[PDB]
Symmetry: D2
Subunit: 206 residues, 4 copies
C-alpha cells in the first residue's frame, strides 16, 4: 500500500508538525493575533493556488476520476468563503503581502501539476490534504479552551474532510499499483518535498 | 459588445445548426434510435474533455473568476450523470468507437486552453455553451410532442443554463474590453473555428 | 525492445505508406506539381508545430536529455529554411488554408505533449521521425532518376537523420525498460494513433479533388 | 517603448545588484572559493530549468519566433558545458543540494510559462537575460585584474550575449505594442517579480 509507505519514510518530517509550535499554541489558545493573521493571509493565497493545482490535475485525470475532481474542487472552493468570512469577522485584509515561503510552495505545486506525471501530482494532493487532516486532527484532540478559530478546526478535522482524504488515499493506492518502481520513486520524492513544504509553512506565522 | 460581434460574424455558420437536420428530427420525434445513440456516445466523450478544457482555463484564470469556474465545472460535471443515467435506461454502451470529428474538436479545445491566451480559451467556452443553448432552445421551441430525450432538451434549454451562458457572456465582454485588436482577432478566429466544429458535430449521428 | 515491438504491431498500417501513392509518384517522377505544392504547404505547417511539440517534451524531460532536445530542436528547425527555400524557387505561398487532417494531427500531438506522460510523448516523437525516415528511405531506394525535390528526399533519408532516429530509438527503448505494462500500453496506443495520422497525411496532397 | 518602461519602474531593485556584494568581490578578486562554488552549483540548476522555461515559451510562440527560440535554446544550452567543465576543473560536484530560493525562482518561471500569457513569459525572459547582461557587464567594467572566472564574466558581458539581449528586447517591444494596457501591466508585474528574484539569487552564494 503506497499510502502507508509514503507516510513511513517521512514520519520523521511529519513528526515535526504533529504538533508544530503553531498548533500547540492553537490548542492551548496561547496563540497570539499577529501570528494567526499572518497565517491567514498566506494560507488564503495557498488555497487559491491549490485550486489551480487541482484544476491542472483534473485536466490530466483519467475519465473515471472526473466526477471526483469536479466535486472536490467545488468542495475545496468553499474554503475560500471560510477565509473571507473570518476576515470580515476580524477586519483583516487578505490582499496584503505574501511571504516568500508560500510562493515557493505554490510554485512547486503548479510545476508538478504542469510538468510532472499524474501520479506525482495526485501524490502531492494526497500529501497536502492528509497533512492538514492530521495536523488539525491533533489540534482537535488536544484542544483546551475555546478557539476563536473553531471554524478552521471544525473543517480540516471533520469526518467529511476525513472522508475526502480517505477517498484520495484509495484512488492513490490504485494508481500506484499499476505503476513501476521508477515512476513510484518520482512520486515518493514529490511526497517528501511536499512534506517539507507543509512543515515550513507553519513557520510563516512567526 | 464582443459577444454580439462574434455572433454576427459567424451568423451563416450558426444558421446551419439552427436548426440542423438532427434538431429537426429531435423536434418532430422522427429521430432513429441508431442516430441518437451515435450522437450520445460521441457527445459524452466531448463532455468529458470539455470539463478538462474548463479545468485548464480555470488554472490560468484571474483570481476573481476562480469561484465561477469551480461552480461551473461542478455544474457541467452533472451532465456526465445525465448521459450515464440515460444510457442505462436505453441499454446503450458509452465505451464505443469515437468519431474522428469528435476527437478533432476535442484536441483543438485542449490546444487552445493549453497554448492560447485566456481570452481565446474563454471565447471558445462561450461559443460552445452559447451554441448548445441556442440549438437546444430551438428544439424546445419547435418540439411537436414530448420527446424520449426530454432530459437533454430541458437541461440545455433551461433558464438555469441560459443564466450560465449569460454569466459567461458578461465576463467575456469585460475581458474583451481591456484587450487589443490583435488579441481580439485571435479570439474571433477561435470563435469561428469552434463554430465550424459545433456545426460539424451534428453530422456524427449520421456517420456510418 | 520496445521500439521493434511498436513497429511489429503496426506493420500493417506502415505497409500502407511503404510505399504510399505519393511516394510511388515521387520515385517515378509522375508526381504532379499541384500535389507536391499541397503537400508542401501542409507539411510546413506540421513541421512548425512538430517543433512546438518537441519543445513541450523538452520542458518535461529528464536532466540528461536536455542537451539532446536542444540539439534536436535546433536540427529540426533547419527544416523550416528547407521548406522556405524550396517555396521561393517555386514561387509558391505557404500562407494558405491548412488541411483538416493536418490540423487534427498537430492538435493530437500537442495534446499528448501537454497532458500525456513523457513516455507517450517521446513514443509519439519516435513514431513521427521513424515513419519519415522509412518513407523517404523507400523513395531514395526506388528513385528511377533524379527528382526536382531531391533536397527533401536526401534530408529525411540521410545518414545524419537516420542517426538522429537511432538516437531517439535508444533513448525510448531505455525509458520503456523502467516503466510498467500499463504505462507502456498507453504509449503503444499513442504510437498506433500517430501511425494512422502518418498514413493519412500523405492523402492530403490529393485533397481538393 | 516597453523595455525602457520596465527598467525604469524597477530601477531601484536593479541598483541593488548593480553592483551586489557578489559582483564587487568578483571584480576585486576577493571572492572566496566557497561562495563561488555555491553560486555555481545553484546557477547551474537555474540554467537547466531556464532551458525548460524557454522551451515552454517556444511552444506558445508565434510562427515567426520559432527560428529565434530554436537558436536561442541551442545557444543557451552551451552554458551547461561551460558550467560542467569549470566544475570538472575545480573538482566540484554539481549534483548537490540546491538552495530553496533557487528552486523557487525556477518554479516561478515555470508557472509563468505554463499558465501565463506569451507576453508575461517573454517579459520574464528579457528581465532574466538583461539582468545578467548588466550584472556581468558591471563586473567587467570594474575588474582590477584578470579573474580565474574570467570566462563567466566574458560570456555574459560579451558582444554576442548583448546582441542576444538586444534581439529579445526588440521582439518584446513589438509584442507589447499590439497588446492592450491590461496584459501589459500583467507583464509589468512579472518583470517586477523576476527582478526581485535576480536580486535574491546573488545572496545564495553566502
Ligand atoms: C539567477 C540567474 N538569473 C539569470 C541568468 C541568466 O540566464 P541565462 O544563463 O539562462 O541566459 C542566470 N544564469 N542566473
Amino acid at each position: 500500500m503506497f499510502s502507508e509507505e509514503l507516510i513511513k519514510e517521512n514520519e520523521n518530517i511529519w513528526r515535526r508538525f504533529l504538533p508544530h509550535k503553531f498548533l500547540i499554541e492553537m490548542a492551548e489558545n496561547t496563540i497570539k493575533k499577529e501570528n494567526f493573521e499572518k497565517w491567514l493571509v498566506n494560507d488564503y493565497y495557498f488555497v487559491k493556488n491549490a485550486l489551480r493545482f487541482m484544476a491542472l490535475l483534473m485536466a490530466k485525470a483519467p475519465d473515471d476520476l472526473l466526477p471526483f475532481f469536479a466535486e472536490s474542487i467545488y468542495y475545496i472552493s468553499k474554503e475560500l468563503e471560510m477565509f473571507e468570512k473570518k476576515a470580515q469577522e476580524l477586519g483583516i485584509s487578505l490582499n496584503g503581502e505574501i511571504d516568500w515561503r508560500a510562493k515557493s510552495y505554490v510554485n512547486y505545486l503548479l510545476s508538478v501539476a504542469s510538468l510532472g506525471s499524474f501520479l506525482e501530482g495526485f501524490t502531492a494532493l494526497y500529501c497536502e490534504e492528509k497533512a492538514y487532516y492530521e495536523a488539525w486532527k491533533w489540534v482537535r484532540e488536544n484542544l483546551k479552551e475555546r478557539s476563536p478559530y473553531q471554524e478552521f478546526i471544525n473543517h480540516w478535522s471533520s469526518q467529511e474532510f476525513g472522508e475526502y482524504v480517505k477517498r484520495i488515499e484509495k484512488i492513490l493506492n490504485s494508481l500506484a499499483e499499476k505503476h513501476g518502481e521508477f515512476e513510484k520513486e518520482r512520486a515518493r520524492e514529490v511526497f517528501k518535498e511536499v512534506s517539507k513544504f507543509e512543515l515550513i509553512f507553519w513557520d510563516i506565522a512567526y
